[PDB]
Symmetry: D2
Subunit: 445 residues, 4 copies
């Protein structure tokens, strides 16, 4: 894909260059490839596209690239295969380019290491370096008129200098993932670290791996369990405590009929349901969110707990402990003492002294609201929320916005499009749909 | 255990001889063995006990002994081991007696075939044949007074119907156990028809209705738990030319949770914790702890069913033309079954707040566990003032008015106490330990 | 690929259209696709290729398409992916074309049903229908002092007529022929595993009759037939006769299975004759001479259930007899059953049929090539393939523009993967380069 | 349980070693004397005079190889009692019940306990025989005893042992001897003596003191390709995260253990009769066709974890020669060179293929040697009685019931010597394992004490 000059009026600008935007770039590449679409042989003009990414290079959840962590999803659900297995951007073709395809085949697994899947996506992203501006953190999207709004100005701050630059585009995609969700009761402190900063921030805080640190973990989903488990290996003499509101870690549902909710063609079914039915369906399938844990990991943690029981029958004396049905009422963290004191109570309708508290409570996916505040008056009268259509384009007042201008949301549409919306599950197929939604008419010539 | 003359006054009578009562028989045998508890060499009188069972011989859910069906619970949770691995009634000792222990070890499984686990319990039950009266269906329990002008009940008379002749018999006992499992729960909208069969009568009744294994029958299955899936899977083999249809309210068959922390709710020692919780917490825990007992399907069976549907997809991409189909998120609104036509018409709608014509409808909708209320109606006036339900204590004895019932008489409930004692109550999970508790509760002082 | 007239001089004729020839066809198609290799936009001439296959349509071991039978190899080792995942002939693209890709993904398996993998190869094969003559059984290859082409004669299986085609280069890719123990007699009741699904139901028509059926062997095919008979003829009495003491599991462990990697062919081929011979023994625990662990366990479980019902093994409906050999079969006379005599391999059975699951010989190319074996270098009594599978010829008797290639029968020189699906995709690429490379430049 | 016999009295049986094999005998004797388990034992008012001598200071089971996460290779049903009598108080399940852990083990859904747990189970069994086990006693010889100088016939034996802490020699007299001493470390010949060359049996006990700083980038080599080699190779990579470990194997690859049910029937207790009755040639051949289930192979699950770990190295760097942890297949050690503790040792390698020639040198801080065990130490212990064997025998020959052949004109039939754990050649691969101990313990009690228990 060839670059567009910074000051030209773009056809599409995408905010963020994680897997969701990367899937759009790949699908646009594939749509322009005469090998993949026969009609693309007669397309001599590439749309003017640009991506703004805050990081200095492509990276995927590097704070949680914990040792031995695996993908939670089959590699067939990579960024291209479910749309076109012939794509050059498939995981298997990436392995072939690295000389690793037979070696991966002998693993007999559908679940690559997360480190490996990140490298796969890094390898894909490098092929889009002419249209990705790294180190650009978008701060706002502003209306533009050339009395109907027909373009948008996207302002971004360069991470190295702090300077604000502006780009004009007819269409915008917001694909910025999630922001760390912290319980409101917790204070800010270098010893309280969210799961998104585990690998990147915790080793600097606790530098001596042999010290008997007391480390608490708040949560009961996949990241909490991974952090609890990894800490016991990384700090072999530590005392770790898992604080959970629930009565037990719960396994993710890997059964085949249930997992059909992640099928790409199921987005059509989910979207067509009423709000009441969508709301309840998202709970009747709670057992496959990031609120649950891979069975294998639950079993490994249980086995580790059992071995403590063999050595000592008194669970309160264990080096590593799980405290179910608890909530944090208070954190004391002021003073020269290097440990904080955490006060715990039952979560139905006790104090720890810790060197650190890892908080694995997931993410908010509302950061697009701040970015879009200066265009929210273009929504239909009476709307206080952005409403995405089936093709992820947000509803606009047609008398205020030209039909050739628009804004799409990616990754924050679980309520309308289903649990798969924030995952890798449907990115390949969705990237293709996005190309048809945004560029279809333009590509028709 | 030696028999008591049928017309004598018993110390204990148990209604039903399924796993729950058998575990009591086993636990009492073990309590009387001076080798297993030393404090028993000085017992020179065995309690007078008898069990009444309506089936003609011991059998465990024989209507659902589907070929290849497996236990859903580890064999370690047999009828003795969790109470005493030394008991002669453990599953591993049964295998040793049959000459099969090394061969089972090489299976490397915790889940025996249901056929084998039934035979294990059959092997246990034969050792009590002198104290089990088969072919007797208890119909009522009535008050008994040694002195008729006394104001206090000191025994109960248990009346039973001979299943072969219909004669009513009576036995007297100081104490009564009701361990009668469940009765078929049928959706209230369904009509009565010999072509509508509950899952509990699958193996025994459906082959009599559909005699031609080669006819292309249309057979529907209602439900989405373990029994529905087993019947759905088995029908495709037993009637190879049939067209089977699985009708479920839910959107998908859901797997049983086999993960280790969740399943601790089935631990025997959790019964104390659960029982002592408030009504509000117990009611909430029963919803949040785990999906209902047989309301979900063993993962392995789901995958086998899924693979079979995939193979249909390989042969024909059009799901509507498949021989075997799943119709999720449906409810039955009407069944037409009148006229000389031998197929019924089932009317379907979405299950959120279509027609099949079938030769048979298997209904895999579980059980009610309230039949003790009918059996005990003639003694329910002995409950404390104002009670309209039987209320069991921790040791499963129901509350009685102490001024109306002698303290040497009582009634215990087994298997119907999920509300007060937890999800494990109706399962095999805690029978070994519970049988031990029941022996202490019922015979402890006497022993 | 466009068809070339039958009587023209072909560039290549391949004998057989099984997976091995199909992978060559696929690789040739891919070599001509400018979309896959850029150096192909300036290739304006397709080579003249033709395939002769004796079956009437594409079919893959249909005598062993037993219900529930599964692939023994990961689907990634299909006919293209290991050579080029972008190919339109991958198993995943096939599933996508069938509208089944997400549905297979939810199976969470690398091992498709054999029925499905056959349909994948059938779907591939249909794209070459213009260059494949089905129902043609090749009977001889004849030279044509410089032999500079070959004439391949084939017998039409339906009419019996013999037809001939001329080509400069020949590939022999005919798999294996049924290996029958030399002591067994010929009798319609003695059937090799390769004709199980095809022939036994013709012999034993009543699925409910209490037939006595023996199975001879202990490998994957023996176990599949033994297991299947118990479902296909539910009242039968089956007996598994094996020389070994037990069914042995196939080794699925990752280090051992690296001998099947495509890049191992270079290493194996370059080893001395002595090392190749020993290497084939010291890793032969994976030759269809062993059984998928899952199947062993299912069979053992079935035997266990018989033990639950009757502790006396001699009374079981279905039995395994280890460490046995057949010493004599009586099959002369009107009695519908044969009597099999057994002895220790360190007792008589009366059977309606005997299935023989003893594998295959891979020497049938010698008979086909006898009329050109004088073109070998002096003193050679065996066909000797180079690394690129082309057989050695005397250069003063054979033009360098003519040659003969062997496929699937070269285990001794190229390794255990040679007769499997394991390296077909990569080998197809090598074969296209060996036979057509200069022509493509 | 069993009451002690005074040290200087004439014992009925003395067992050399108190590992699992002798422990199964003690357990089986206890059970034979238990009226709950054997009906005929309420009328047994005299316990045989039995004693066990164990050189370690307390019961311990392969403590050098109690590596973190290590598992049993065998189903817990094959414990020290269950296959003989599941009602026994010494079953693993009864042990779990006594520890208050049975339901917790049930929720593990595994037949393969941690080795740490299975050792504790056997320690729990052993503690009940503490009155008849003399720990810290290393038996050094067995000598003939003639209770009558007016006779040449040997009718008892004297067993001498050296106390490992004081060095004093103690002597006990017995009619019957069991030798159940497991194996001695099998070391490649030619190796120099250096405390950094550690056999797998001393891994957990010796290596951590040698390499104290878990963060240091040590170079550690591992020799072997069986289960112990793989466990050590894997464990080293976790215990020393910055180390460079190298696995040296003669074979081309680590091989998986055969877990299939028909093959594993060779381990059934009732198969000892069939194996024992075979000819010498057939037994020799049968041992070779089943050498794929010894400790010479690796649990599939562990192979896969090691393979996965190697693959992750491939992702970071395609150059295998630069990997932190490496496997060098088809290699043999030609020499191990050292220059004093101040320096690293040099391991020299060559191809193990026939001399039909790549080579390497490694510089390592330690070398772990996982090359198995010899099981012939009974010959040294029995040297002073080997003249009592039948004419022409240069080997101890055990009968079916494990009693060795003696010249009847030199030895009374009321005296005898039995061997346990070293009889694979006559009794099969299970002989050295846990696989048939429960049943064999029963047989040994009948062989040694049967008549005595009857009368
Ligand atoms: C360890 C882990 C934990 C996970 N936890 C959850 C979870 O709790 N819930 C859930 O539904 N999914 C979760 N996922 C799945 C995850 O969301 C998907 O795998 C995938 O990351 C989604 O891609 P995305 O591009 O929509 O978001 P991302 O992977 O988040 O990509 C967003 C990109 O936008 C960039 N960006 C953000 N803001 C700006 C800005 N203002 N300007 C410029 N660039 C910006 C970011 O730097 C980032 O590169 C998790 C995955 C992993 C690996
Ligand atoms: C196929 C199958 C399905 C199951 N479904 C469920 C389920 O839906 N929900 C759940 O919680 N558990 C279910 N279970 C578990 C089951 O309840 C236990 O395994 C076990 O059967 C409980 O033993 P019980 O003795 O309390 O009941 P049972 O096994 O039912 O024993 C009850 C006995 O009492 C006899 N009896 C009944 N009434 C009388 C009478 N009036 N007079 C004399 N005798 C009488 C019966 O004949 C029977 O033998 C199921 C098990 C199987 C195998
Ligand atoms: C059920 C089963 C059993 C197997 N057993 C073994 C085994 O015992 N040992 C082993 O090493 N591999 C075995 N395999 C693997 C098998 O060889 C490969 O999967 C694959 O079939 C090899 O492809 P091929 O094209 O080389 O042979 P094939 O699949 O055999 O193809 C050969 C083709 O040539 C055709 N042909 C034969 N003769 C002629 C002729 N004279 N003229 C024209 N056409 C002809 C045949 O009709 C056939 O289509 C087995 C596979 C399966 C599915
Ligand atoms: C890590 C590990 C590795 C194994 N490797 C092998 C293997 O390579 N090959 C194989 O066939 N089996 C192997 N096994 C199986 C093992 O042999 C059995 O599990 C079990 O230990 C056998 O019991 P045993 O009592 O016969 O021998 P051991 O368990 O070794 O017990 C022998 C006891 O005798 C004591 N003893 C020795 N000499 C004397 C003496 N002179 N005086 C007094 N006491 C003495 C020892 O201290 C020891 O306690 C291994 C097991 C484990 C856990
Ligand atoms: Ca479990
Ligand atoms: Ca594998």
């Amino acid at each position: 894909l060839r670059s567009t000059p910074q000051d030209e009026l773009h056809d599409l600008l995408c905010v963020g260059f994680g897997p969701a935007s990367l899937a759009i770039a790949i699908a646009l590449h594939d749509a322009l490839d005469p090998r993949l679409n026969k009609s693309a042989s007669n397309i001599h003009a590439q749309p003017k596209i640009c991506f703004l990414e805050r990081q200095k290079q492509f990276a995927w959840h590097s704070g949680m690239l914990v040792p031995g962590s695996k993908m939670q999803i089959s590699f067939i659900k990579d960024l291209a295969t479910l749309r076109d297995p012939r794509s050059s951007f498939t995981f298997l073709n990436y392995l072939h380019q690295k000389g690793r395809l037979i070696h991966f085949t002998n693993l007999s697994t559908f679940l690559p290491a997360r480190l490996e899947f990140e490298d796969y996506m890094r390898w894909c992203a490098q092929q889009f370096s002419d249209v990705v501006a790294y180190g650009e953190e978008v701060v706002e999207v502003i209306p533009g008129k050339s009395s109907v709004v027909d373009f948008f100005t996207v302002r971004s701050r360069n991470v190295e200098t702090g300077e604000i630059s502006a780009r004009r585009t007819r269409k915008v995609v917001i694909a910025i993932g999630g922001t760390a969700k912290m319980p409101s009761g917790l204070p800010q402190d270098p010893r309280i670290i969210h799961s998104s900063k585990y690998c990147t921030t915790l080793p600097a805080l606790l530098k001596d791996k042999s010290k008997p640190y007391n480390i608490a973990v708040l949560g009961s989903g996949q990241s909490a369990a991974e952090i609890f488990h990894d800490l016991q290996k990384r700090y072999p003499n530590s005392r770790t405590t898992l604080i959970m509101r629930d009565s037990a870690m719960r396994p993710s549902d890997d059964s085949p009929f249930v997992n059909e909710i992640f099928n790409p063609e199921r987005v059509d079914k989910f979207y067509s349901q009423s709000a009441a039915e969508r709301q309840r369906s998202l709970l009747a399938d709670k057992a496959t969110n990031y609120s649950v844990v891979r069975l294998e990991l639950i079993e490994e943690i249980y086995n580790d707990m059992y071995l403590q029981r063999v050595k000592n029958p008194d669970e309160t004396q264990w080096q590593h402990r799980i405290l179910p049905e608890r909530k944090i009422t208070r954190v004391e963290h002021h003073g020269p003492q290097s440990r904080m004191r955490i006060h715990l109570k039952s979560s139905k309708p006790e104090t720890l002294e810790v060197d650190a508290l890892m908080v694995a409570t997931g993410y908010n996916r509302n950061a697009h609201e701040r970015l879009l505040s200066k265009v929210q008056h273009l929504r239909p009268t009476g709307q206080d929320q952005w409403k995405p259509h089936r093709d992820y384009r947000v509803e606009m007042d047609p008398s205020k916005v030209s039909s050739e201008a628009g804004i799409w949301l990616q990754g924050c549409n679980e309520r309308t499009h289903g649990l798969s919306d924030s995952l890798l599950s449907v990115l390949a197929v969705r990237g293709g749909e996005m190309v048809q939604s945004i560029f279809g008419e333009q590509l028709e010539r």
